[PDB]
Design a protein around this ligand. Structure first.
Ligand SMILES: Nc1nc2c(ncn2[C@@H]2O[C@H](COP(=O)(O)OP(=O)(O)O)[C@@H](O)[C@H]2O)c(=O)[nH]1
Ligand SMILES: *S(=O)(=O)c1ccc(S(=O)(=O)Nc2cccnc2OC)cc1
Ligand SMILES: [Ca+2]
Length: 168
């Protein structure tokens, strides 16, 4: 089977693990250890083709740059997650983007900008407009998700796999 290697990136508390666990297990998990990284593998039917998705849920604990870069080098596509409720997490996406580009050396690396916590509109700190503008600058798609309500959860994983399939 095709194996699509997805890496979740983004600053702390944005929803990397909640998104991964909603996709994997159909549960909203609210207390997942912030420092725990893990890999997940699932067979999924992508546009009618059985494939395997592998998701590396990074937890930010790899501080040694060569090792972090090694993890990114193995990835084929990236979900770059921020929380719509934390402007600083949106700002931080630029750093993950630069890290990925240094390693992959390809501006067209499969990559979605993911604004999570869309069910907290009343706490929004990052406008849809500014996130769409950043996505346009980077030539990536912007999708807003909620790990709580499941909104666009399958979409971000499937659309990222579609980019991996098309581009690699
Ligand atoms: N309301 C809401 N809370 C979320 C969402 N995603 C994550 N959370 C909460 O935000 C906290 C951090 O999520 P987590 O996935 O552990 O963040 P990570 O550090 O990026 O892995 C947890 O308490 C989650 O329940 C979401 O879409 N909506
Ligand atoms: S490795 O398999 O021993 C390993 C070590 C650390 C992690 S992490 O906590 O998810 N940290 C990161 C992983 C990949 C890229 N950046 C990270 O933190 C900045 C995972 C696997
Ligand atoms: Ca996590």
């Amino acid at each position: 089977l095709a194996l699509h290697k997805v890496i979740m990136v983004g600053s702390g508390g944005v929803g990397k693990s909640a998104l991964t666990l909603q996709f994997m297990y159909d549960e909203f998990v609210e207390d997942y250890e912030p420092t725990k990284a893990d890999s997940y593998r699932k067979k999924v039917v992508l546009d009618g083709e059985e494939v395997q998705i592998d998701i590396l849920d990074t937890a930010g604990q790899e501080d040694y740059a060569a090792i972090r870069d090694n993890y990114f080098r193995s990835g084929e596509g990236f979900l770059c997650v921020f929380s719509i409720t934390e402007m600083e997490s949106f700002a931080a996406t630029a750093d993950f983007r630069e890290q990925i580009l240094r390693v992959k050396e390809d501006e067209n690396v499969p990559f979605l900008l993911v604004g999570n916590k869309s069910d907290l509109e009343d706490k929004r700190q990052v406008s849809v407009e500014e996130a769409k503008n950043r996505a346009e600058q980077w030539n990536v798609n912007y999708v807003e998700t909620s790990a709580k309500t499941r909104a666009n959860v399958d979409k971000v994983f499937f659309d990222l796999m579609r980019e991996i399939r098309a581009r690699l």
